Amino acid sequence: DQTTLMKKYLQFVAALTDVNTPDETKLKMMQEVSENFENVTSSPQYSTFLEHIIPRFLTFLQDGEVQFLQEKPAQQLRKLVLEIIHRIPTNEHLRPHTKNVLSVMFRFLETENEENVLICLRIIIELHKQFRPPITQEIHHFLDFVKQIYKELPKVVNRYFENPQVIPENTVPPPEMVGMITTIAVKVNPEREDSETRTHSIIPRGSLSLKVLAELPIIVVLMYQLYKLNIHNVVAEFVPLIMNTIAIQVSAQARQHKLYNKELYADFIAAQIKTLSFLAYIIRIYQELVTKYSQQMVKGMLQLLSNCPAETAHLRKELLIAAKHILTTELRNQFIPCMDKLFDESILIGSGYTARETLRPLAYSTLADLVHHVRQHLPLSDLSLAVQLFAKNIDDESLPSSIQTMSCKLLLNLVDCIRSKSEQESGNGRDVLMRMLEVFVLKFHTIARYQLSAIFKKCKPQSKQTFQVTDCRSLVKTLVCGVKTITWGITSCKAPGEAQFIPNKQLQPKETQIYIKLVKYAMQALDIYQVQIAGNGQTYIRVANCQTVRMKEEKEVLEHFAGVFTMMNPLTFKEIFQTTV
Amino acid sequence: IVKNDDSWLASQHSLVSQLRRVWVSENFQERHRKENMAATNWKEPKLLAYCLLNYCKRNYGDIELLFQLLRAFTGRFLCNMTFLKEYMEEEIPKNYSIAQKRALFFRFVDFNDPNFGDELKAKVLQHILNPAFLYSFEKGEGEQLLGPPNPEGDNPESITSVFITKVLDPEKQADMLDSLRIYLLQYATLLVEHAPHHIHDNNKNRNSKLRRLMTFAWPCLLSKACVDPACKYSGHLLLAHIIAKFAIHKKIVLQVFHSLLKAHAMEARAIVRQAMAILTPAVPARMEDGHQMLTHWTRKIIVEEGHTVPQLVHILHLIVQHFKVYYPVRHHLVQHMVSAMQRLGFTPSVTIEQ
């Protein structure tokens, strides 16, 4: 009888508040209750079931002393009750109890251990997302509690990293001197080497745990989304706290200590990166106040990039996403002086294996957008550094073809900047332009030899391969456009130590050889347009004897390829084409 | 000269010795890694590698100089080293004999050179050892290449014995770089998949080599919070292969399955998918109540979790991929499947992938 089963579960819930019942019996009863919520929610009695259980669960949670040992049956029972509250469906039946549950959870956020606080935060997020209640004083008290945690963070950092404390052996430390869930072993009698052995796990206080600090900013973002008109001025107070938080760095001496904890440092960096994501969300609303504090922000996020652990690829990804969002705003101008460090690939990507394979496209696309927006302010040295990095990106066959095209397009745009800065500096701009042209010619050769041979091998006679063909076409088009731009830059730059510019000049023999190789390789590379892509999925080489090209893209790119040579001095054109014809 | 005469350099031993000296030298690798963009010598490492490769093509016994060529892959030079990769992945498996492949492996084992770090050994396993051994196993030369199927790990001729004892030595494991560990787990996956008989004979009452290989994988099952996900899941992929090949106890299989179910992170999606594709068919084939265990754990994770979307979508992707396996337990899963389908399809702001 489902009614009898529901009454039995109600008796179990009432027995939860009972003092006589053994703890393990309560744990088993609630474990049975947790598994059977699928059956309870079907019946219309689920509403009365909620009206009975939710007040009782809240009462038991309120009455209990805050536990901090993970193996304690009372702590496990409290955690199971909280998880049961989280698992309760969020339909309209939860609405009457929502206010009481939210108030109870908000009071526990001030007071309880990491496990229970994290569960309470999840419950708060779910309830506020689904039901969206109006603003109460508990919300302002939460925002003040978060601000207090942000202010307390340097003390936490000093306590755990800067001045670690040795836990007395065979003793159970208070939770205020552990930074994370730590397991310890205790022998009951210290008088002898042989004694009864017991093991305990200590849960930190929620006000000191960095996992809670990592989880907080998303809740603030959610409540700003729900309560935008009310808490707008309160969020403004977070900005200096956010900047101070991201500015914090653990000293080098602390990391080398005998008591240094790597997982706690990972949690600390995770909290800092979550704070930077919060900043990236609020950057466009509070842009004036962020601008006032931006000078520390540049340092803070450069240091987050330097200090992000190699193993934590997800943290590096979130940091890169937040940086991409921030760089879209005016604040990218502040990075103009420091981009010489930001071009260090170790800073940007690190030495992690997953970071190197997965996140390099994200890193170079973010940096490419930054360079493209900033390019007119970068000096000649920074332009050369960006050229060197993205030139190395052109060749790199581990990167997807989209990233190679993106780097080619970046190098194309730099050419007029490199020209302007070289004319102002009277520097070596023509040399870096020649080096870019060489990198483009070598990419043409690589496409002709490796990529086109594979594409042709994959073809079959008529009557992701599409992606490989479309990206080869796009890369060849970008290479042609970049070669034309680089040629215009070379033909528009004063040479190193030259007296004066002249409106066109016969190229040196080495440059002419490079252009001869360009003709040889690009004429092979432009064969990609022969490979058609039928609607049936067949990729086939078109009939060889056909000069009536039906495609506009091939006509345009072939005319652009000829545009490279038509702007040269007649003697250079003659030397190249006598050999190449 | 090498281009015009392919056979000339194979005899000039002193010249090639000084070419190697330059190639392994610190100043050369620093200068070419830390060039100015306008540096004239950008072709130099390609030309030097081409010469050293030409020497190595005819003199197979000089495995040391072959390994030093992988310094081309540790940097990121601005000249295309694809000809080295092509040679190492294609020509070595095709051309080298079984004895020469064994020499490659045994030189990799005893390579005690202070200047040859873990990343270079990772390059060795990635480009030389694994392709060659994969080609040999595909051709069927596994018995000759591995040598004797020594159940007792002492025999210095048994490739599996020396690999598990010397290479996987627990004392080495501490400072292990993640790339080296990953490619060692890939080599162990080759050994297990192609040559299970050499790893463990089911007739033997006990074998230490299987235990020591599982022990090498096992740190991935530890619940540490700062591990590169590819290393952890590569270890799960090795355990998935071992579980498929060998009659492993239930608790290990269930722990590996549960840990792969909790693996909803984006960073290691492909490796987790490979491991699950291997393991999910294996679970019903392994134990007498495999279908019930599949049901129990899938239901448990879908219910007790899934308040976070990525976990639920991960489990649903796994169900979709292996629906044929889940077919005999369809009736249990289908309710949660349709509920999650409705929720994911109608919750606000559905991404097209969801």
Short mmCIF file of N, CA, C and O in Angstrom, two decimals, chain A residues 34-35 38 83 86-87 122 126 262-263 266-267 309-314 317 345 352-355 357-358 360 364 384 387-388 391-393 395-397 428 431-432 435-436 438-439 442 446 450, chain B residues 32-39 42-43 74 76-80 82-83 85-86 126 178-179 182-183 186 223-231 266-268 271 299 303-305 307 335-336 348:
data_model
loop_
_atom_site.label_atom_id
_atom_site.label_comp_id
_atom_site.label_asym_id
_atom_site.label_seq_id
_atom_site.Cartn_x
_atom_site.Cartn_y
_atom_site.Cartn_z
N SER A 34 15.65 8.28 0.94
CA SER A 34 16.26 8.96 -0.20
C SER A 34 16.04 8.18 -1.49
O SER A 34 15.76 8.77 -2.55
N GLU A 35 16.16 6.85 -1.44
CA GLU A 35 16.03 6.04 -2.64
C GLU A 35 14.61 6.02 -3.18
O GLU A 35 14.40 5.80 -4.38
N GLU A 38 11.25 8.60 -5.82
CA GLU A 38 10.58 8.42 -7.10
C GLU A 38 9.14 7.97 -6.91
O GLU A 38 8.24 8.44 -7.62
N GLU A 83 21.17 16.67 1.39
CA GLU A 83 21.08 16.17 0.02
C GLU A 83 19.66 15.77 -0.34
O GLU A 83 19.25 15.92 -1.50
N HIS A 86 17.94 18.88 -1.22
CA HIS A 86 18.34 19.28 -2.56
C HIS A 86 17.63 18.45 -3.63
O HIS A 86 17.25 18.97 -4.68
N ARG A 87 17.45 17.15 -3.37
CA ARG A 87 16.86 16.26 -4.37
C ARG A 87 15.36 16.48 -4.52
O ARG A 87 14.78 16.01 -5.51
N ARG A 122 24.18 24.96 -3.11
CA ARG A 122 23.52 24.35 -4.26
C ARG A 122 22.01 24.48 -4.16
O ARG A 122 21.33 24.80 -5.15
N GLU A 126 19.52 26.51 -6.76
CA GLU A 126 18.40 25.86 -7.43
C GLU A 126 17.09 26.58 -7.13
O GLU A 126 16.29 26.86 -8.03
N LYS A 262 49.69 21.20 -1.96
CA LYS A 262 49.44 21.53 -3.36
C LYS A 262 47.94 21.59 -3.67
O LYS A 262 47.51 22.44 -4.46
N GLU A 263 47.14 20.72 -3.05
CA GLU A 263 45.71 20.74 -3.32
C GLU A 263 45.05 21.99 -2.76
O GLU A 263 44.14 22.56 -3.38
N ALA A 266 45.77 24.67 -5.13
CA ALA A 266 44.89 24.53 -6.28
C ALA A 266 43.51 25.11 -5.97
O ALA A 266 42.92 25.80 -6.81
N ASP A 267 42.98 24.84 -4.78
CA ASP A 267 41.69 25.40 -4.39
C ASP A 267 41.75 26.92 -4.31
O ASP A 267 40.81 27.61 -4.70
N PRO A 309 48.14 26.22 -12.02
CA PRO A 309 48.82 24.92 -12.08
C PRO A 309 48.67 24.26 -13.44
O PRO A 309 47.65 24.41 -14.12
N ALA A 310 49.71 23.51 -13.82
CA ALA A 310 49.69 22.82 -15.11
C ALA A 310 48.65 21.71 -15.13
O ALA A 310 48.03 21.47 -16.17
N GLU A 311 48.44 21.03 -14.01
CA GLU A 311 47.50 19.92 -13.98
C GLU A 311 46.06 20.38 -14.09
O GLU A 311 45.22 19.65 -14.63
N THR A 312 45.74 21.58 -13.59
CA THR A 312 44.37 22.08 -13.61
C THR A 312 44.10 22.77 -14.94
O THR A 312 44.19 23.99 -15.09
N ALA A 313 43.76 21.95 -15.94
CA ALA A 313 43.44 22.49 -17.26
C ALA A 313 42.10 23.21 -17.28
O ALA A 313 41.94 24.18 -18.03
N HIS A 314 41.14 22.75 -16.48
CA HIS A 314 39.84 23.42 -16.42
C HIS A 314 39.97 24.83 -15.85
O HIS A 314 39.31 25.77 -16.32
N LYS A 317 41.40 26.95 -18.59
CA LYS A 317 40.35 27.26 -19.56
C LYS A 317 39.45 28.39 -19.06
O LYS A 317 39.15 29.34 -19.79
N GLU A 345 54.65 31.94 -24.08
CA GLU A 345 53.72 30.83 -24.18
C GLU A 345 53.61 30.06 -22.87
O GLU A 345 52.56 29.49 -22.56
N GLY A 352 51.23 22.06 -19.10
CA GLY A 352 50.35 20.92 -18.97
C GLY A 352 50.09 20.24 -20.30
O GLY A 352 50.08 20.86 -21.35
N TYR A 353 49.87 18.93 -20.23
CA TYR A 353 49.62 18.16 -21.45
C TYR A 353 48.25 18.47 -22.03
O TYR A 353 48.12 18.79 -23.22
N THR A 354 47.21 18.39 -21.20
CA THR A 354 45.87 18.73 -21.66
C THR A 354 45.76 20.19 -22.04
O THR A 354 45.10 20.53 -23.02
N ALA A 355 46.42 21.07 -21.29
CA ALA A 355 46.41 22.48 -21.67
C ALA A 355 47.05 22.69 -23.04
O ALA A 355 46.45 23.33 -23.91
N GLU A 357 47.44 20.45 -25.61
CA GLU A 357 46.64 20.00 -26.74
C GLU A 357 45.35 20.82 -26.88
O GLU A 357 45.07 21.37 -27.95
N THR A 358 44.54 20.90 -25.82
CA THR A 358 43.20 21.45 -25.95
C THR A 358 43.19 22.98 -26.09
O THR A 358 42.55 23.51 -27.01
N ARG A 360 45.40 25.58 -26.62
CA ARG A 360 46.18 26.48 -27.46
C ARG A 360 45.34 27.27 -28.46
O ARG A 360 45.58 28.48 -28.61
N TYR A 364 45.67 31.36 -28.35
CA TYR A 364 46.09 32.16 -29.49
C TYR A 364 44.95 32.98 -30.09
O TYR A 364 45.20 34.07 -30.58
N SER A 384 57.34 42.52 -33.54
CA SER A 384 58.21 41.42 -33.93
C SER A 384 57.95 40.18 -33.10
O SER A 384 57.99 39.06 -33.62
N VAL A 387 54.76 38.65 -34.36
CA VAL A 387 55.06 38.02 -35.64
C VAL A 387 55.75 36.68 -35.43
O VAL A 387 55.40 35.69 -36.06
N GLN A 388 56.76 36.65 -34.56
CA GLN A 388 57.50 35.42 -34.31
C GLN A 388 56.61 34.32 -33.74
O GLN A 388 56.64 33.17 -34.21
N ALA A 391 53.98 33.33 -36.55
CA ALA A 391 54.72 32.63 -37.58
C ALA A 391 54.99 31.19 -37.17
O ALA A 391 54.76 30.25 -37.95
N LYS A 392 55.49 30.99 -35.95
CA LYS A 392 55.56 29.63 -35.40
C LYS A 392 54.20 28.94 -35.41
O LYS A 392 54.13 27.72 -35.54
N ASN A 393 53.12 29.70 -35.26
CA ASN A 393 51.80 29.08 -35.33
C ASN A 393 51.43 28.66 -36.76
O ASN A 393 50.69 27.69 -36.94
N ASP A 395 53.16 27.27 -39.21
CA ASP A 395 53.68 25.95 -39.58
C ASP A 395 53.09 24.82 -38.74
O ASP A 395 52.99 23.69 -39.23
N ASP A 396 52.69 25.10 -37.50
CA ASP A 396 52.43 24.06 -36.52
C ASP A 396 51.24 23.21 -36.94
O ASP A 396 50.09 23.67 -36.94
N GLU A 397 51.52 21.96 -37.31
CA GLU A 397 50.50 21.04 -37.80
C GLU A 397 49.69 20.40 -36.69
O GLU A 397 48.73 19.67 -36.99
N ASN A 428 64.42 47.45 -38.52
CA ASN A 428 64.59 46.27 -39.37
C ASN A 428 63.26 45.74 -39.90
O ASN A 428 63.12 44.53 -40.11
N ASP A 431 63.25 43.42 -42.90
CA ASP A 431 63.75 42.08 -42.61
C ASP A 431 62.66 41.18 -42.03
O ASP A 431 62.52 40.02 -42.43
N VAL A 432 61.91 41.67 -41.05
CA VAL A 432 60.81 40.86 -40.51
C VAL A 432 59.72 40.65 -41.56
O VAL A 432 59.09 39.58 -41.59
N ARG A 435 61.06 37.81 -43.60
CA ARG A 435 60.89 36.58 -42.83
C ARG A 435 59.44 36.08 -42.87
O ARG A 435 59.19 34.87 -42.98
N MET A 436 58.48 37.00 -42.79
CA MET A 436 57.08 36.61 -42.95
C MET A 436 56.80 36.05 -44.34
O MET A 436 56.07 35.07 -44.49
N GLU A 438 58.91 34.51 -46.26
CA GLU A 438 59.51 33.18 -46.27
C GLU A 438 58.63 32.16 -45.55
O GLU A 438 58.47 31.03 -46.03
N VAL A 439 58.07 32.53 -44.40
CA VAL A 439 57.15 31.65 -43.69
C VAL A 439 55.91 31.34 -44.53
O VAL A 439 55.43 30.20 -44.55
N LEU A 442 57.01 28.86 -47.29
CA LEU A 442 57.17 27.53 -46.72
C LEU A 442 55.83 26.89 -46.36
O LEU A 442 55.67 25.67 -46.49
N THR A 446 54.43 23.37 -47.83
CA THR A 446 53.88 22.33 -46.97
C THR A 446 52.48 21.90 -47.43
O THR A 446 52.16 20.71 -47.43
N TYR A 450 52.39 17.94 -48.46
CA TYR A 450 51.63 17.07 -47.56
C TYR A 450 50.11 17.12 -47.71
O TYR A 450 49.47 16.09 -47.91
N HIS B 32 68.52 28.43 -31.26
CA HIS B 32 67.42 28.22 -32.19
C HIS B 32 66.04 28.30 -31.56
O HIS B 32 65.08 28.70 -32.24
N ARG B 33 65.88 27.95 -30.28
CA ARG B 33 64.60 28.21 -29.62
C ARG B 33 64.40 29.69 -29.32
O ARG B 33 63.26 30.17 -29.39
N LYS B 34 65.45 30.42 -28.99
CA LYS B 34 65.34 31.80 -28.54
C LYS B 34 65.88 32.77 -29.60
O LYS B 34 66.53 33.77 -29.28
N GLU B 35 65.62 32.47 -30.87
CA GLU B 35 66.09 33.33 -31.96
C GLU B 35 65.43 34.70 -31.94
O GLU B 35 64.34 34.90 -31.38
N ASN B 36 66.11 35.66 -32.56
CA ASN B 36 65.45 36.81 -33.16
C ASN B 36 64.78 36.40 -34.46
O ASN B 36 65.27 35.55 -35.19
N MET B 37 63.62 37.01 -34.73
CA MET B 37 62.88 36.70 -35.95
C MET B 37 63.72 36.89 -37.20
O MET B 37 63.56 36.15 -38.18
N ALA B 38 64.62 37.87 -37.20
CA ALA B 38 65.51 38.15 -38.32
C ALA B 38 66.78 37.29 -38.33
O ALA B 38 67.67 37.57 -39.13
N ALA B 39 66.90 36.29 -37.46
CA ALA B 39 68.10 35.46 -37.47
C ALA B 39 68.27 34.72 -38.80
O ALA B 39 67.32 34.15 -39.35
N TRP B 42 67.91 30.23 -39.44
CA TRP B 42 66.67 29.52 -39.13
C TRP B 42 66.57 28.17 -39.85
O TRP B 42 65.91 27.25 -39.35
N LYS B 43 67.23 28.03 -41.00
CA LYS B 43 67.30 26.74 -41.69
C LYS B 43 68.20 25.72 -41.00
O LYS B 43 68.03 24.52 -41.24
N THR B 74 60.90 18.49 -29.30
CA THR B 74 60.73 19.12 -28.00
C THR B 74 60.59 20.63 -28.12
O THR B 74 59.81 21.25 -27.38
N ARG B 76 59.88 24.18 -30.65
CA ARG B 76 59.00 24.54 -31.76
C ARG B 76 59.81 25.41 -32.72
O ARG B 76 59.76 26.64 -32.67
N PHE B 77 60.58 24.75 -33.58
CA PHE B 77 61.36 25.43 -34.59
C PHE B 77 60.47 26.02 -35.67
O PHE B 77 59.33 25.58 -35.89
N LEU B 78 60.99 27.03 -36.34
CA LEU B 78 60.32 27.70 -37.45
C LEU B 78 60.66 27.06 -38.79
O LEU B 78 60.40 27.65 -39.84
N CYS B 79 61.23 25.85 -38.78
CA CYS B 79 61.40 25.04 -39.98
C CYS B 79 60.70 23.71 -39.80
O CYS B 79 60.71 23.13 -38.71
N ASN B 80 60.08 23.23 -40.87
CA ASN B 80 59.20 22.08 -40.83
C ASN B 80 60.01 20.79 -40.67
O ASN B 80 60.74 20.40 -41.58
N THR B 82 58.65 17.85 -40.37
CA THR B 82 57.74 16.76 -40.73
C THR B 82 58.45 15.57 -41.35
O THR B 82 58.00 14.44 -41.20
N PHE B 83 59.56 15.79 -42.06
CA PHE B 83 60.32 14.66 -42.60
C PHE B 83 60.88 13.73 -41.52
O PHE B 83 60.89 12.51 -41.71
N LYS B 85 59.28 13.20 -38.58
CA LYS B 85 58.10 12.50 -38.08
C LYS B 85 57.67 11.42 -39.06
O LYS B 85 57.34 10.29 -38.67
N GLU B 86 57.62 11.77 -40.35
CA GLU B 86 57.35 10.80 -41.40
C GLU B 86 58.31 9.63 -41.35
O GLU B 86 57.88 8.47 -41.34
N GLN B 126 56.33 8.00 -28.22
CA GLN B 126 55.28 8.48 -29.11
C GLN B 126 55.62 8.21 -30.57
O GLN B 126 54.76 7.77 -31.34
N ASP B 178 53.75 13.90 -16.83
CA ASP B 178 52.47 13.39 -17.30
C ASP B 178 52.53 12.87 -18.73
O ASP B 178 51.87 11.88 -19.07
N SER B 179 53.32 13.51 -19.60
CA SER B 179 53.43 13.02 -20.97
C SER B 179 54.08 11.64 -21.03
O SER B 179 53.61 10.74 -21.75
N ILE B 182 51.56 9.11 -19.79
CA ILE B 182 50.53 8.89 -20.80
C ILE B 182 51.02 7.92 -21.87
O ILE B 182 50.34 6.95 -22.23
N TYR B 183 52.21 8.17 -22.41
CA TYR B 183 52.67 7.32 -23.50
C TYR B 183 53.11 5.94 -23.00
O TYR B 183 53.00 4.96 -23.74
N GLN B 186 49.92 4.13 -22.96
CA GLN B 186 49.56 3.72 -24.31
C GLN B 186 50.35 2.49 -24.75
O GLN B 186 49.80 1.57 -25.38
N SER B 223 41.59 9.73 -5.64
CA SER B 223 40.69 10.87 -5.74
C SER B 223 41.39 12.20 -5.51
O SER B 223 40.78 13.13 -4.96
N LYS B 224 42.65 12.33 -5.92
CA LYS B 224 43.34 13.60 -5.80
C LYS B 224 42.67 14.64 -6.70
O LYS B 224 42.03 14.32 -7.69
N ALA B 225 42.84 15.91 -6.32
CA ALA B 225 42.11 17.00 -6.97
C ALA B 225 42.93 17.76 -8.00
O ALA B 225 42.36 18.56 -8.74
N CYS B 226 44.25 17.56 -8.06
CA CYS B 226 45.10 18.26 -9.03
C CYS B 226 45.87 17.21 -9.82
O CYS B 226 47.04 16.93 -9.55
N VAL B 227 45.21 16.64 -10.83
CA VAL B 227 45.82 15.70 -11.76
C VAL B 227 45.39 16.10 -13.16
O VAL B 227 44.22 16.44 -13.39
N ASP B 228 46.33 16.09 -14.10
CA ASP B 228 45.99 16.34 -15.49
C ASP B 228 45.00 15.28 -15.95
O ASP B 228 45.27 14.08 -15.80
N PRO B 229 43.85 15.67 -16.49
CA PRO B 229 42.79 14.67 -16.76
C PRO B 229 43.18 13.62 -17.78
O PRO B 229 42.73 12.47 -17.68
N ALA B 230 44.04 13.96 -18.74
CA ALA B 230 44.47 12.99 -19.73
C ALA B 230 45.27 11.84 -19.12
O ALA B 230 45.08 10.69 -19.49
N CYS B 231 46.13 12.14 -18.15
CA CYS B 231 46.87 11.07 -17.46
C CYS B 231 45.95 10.13 -16.68
O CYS B 231 46.04 8.90 -16.81
N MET B 266 34.86 18.30 -19.52
CA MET B 266 35.06 18.47 -20.95
C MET B 266 36.49 18.14 -21.36
O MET B 266 36.72 17.66 -22.48
N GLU B 267 37.45 18.37 -20.47
CA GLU B 267 38.87 18.31 -20.83
C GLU B 267 39.28 16.92 -21.31
O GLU B 267 40.10 16.79 -22.23
N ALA B 268 38.73 15.87 -20.71
CA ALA B 268 39.11 14.50 -21.04
C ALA B 268 37.98 13.71 -21.69
O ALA B 268 37.88 12.50 -21.48
N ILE B 271 39.11 10.61 -24.17
CA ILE B 271 39.69 9.45 -23.50
C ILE B 271 38.64 8.72 -22.68
O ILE B 271 38.61 7.49 -22.64
N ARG B 299 21.46 4.22 -12.87
CA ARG B 299 20.33 4.81 -12.16
C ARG B 299 20.80 5.66 -10.99
O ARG B 299 20.30 6.77 -10.78
N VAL B 303 20.11 9.67 -10.73
CA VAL B 303 19.21 10.18 -9.70
C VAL B 303 19.96 11.02 -8.67
O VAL B 303 19.67 12.21 -8.51
N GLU B 304 20.91 10.41 -7.96
CA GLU B 304 21.62 11.10 -6.89
C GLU B 304 22.43 12.28 -7.40
O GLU B 304 22.78 13.17 -6.61
N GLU B 305 22.73 12.32 -8.68
CA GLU B 305 23.33 13.47 -9.34
C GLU B 305 22.42 13.86 -10.50
O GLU B 305 21.28 13.39 -10.60
N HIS B 307 21.41 16.97 -10.84
CA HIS B 307 21.08 18.36 -10.54
C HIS B 307 22.03 19.31 -11.24
O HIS B 307 21.68 20.48 -11.45
N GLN B 335 12.40 5.47 -18.16
CA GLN B 335 11.69 6.54 -17.46
C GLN B 335 12.58 7.76 -17.26
O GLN B 335 12.21 8.89 -17.61
N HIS B 336 13.78 7.54 -16.72
CA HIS B 336 14.72 8.63 -16.55
C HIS B 336 15.13 9.22 -17.89
O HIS B 336 15.34 10.43 -18.00
N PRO B 348 14.80 26.56 -20.34
CA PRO B 348 15.16 27.80 -21.04
C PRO B 348 16.58 27.81 -21.60
O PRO B 348 17.52 27.30 -20.98
#
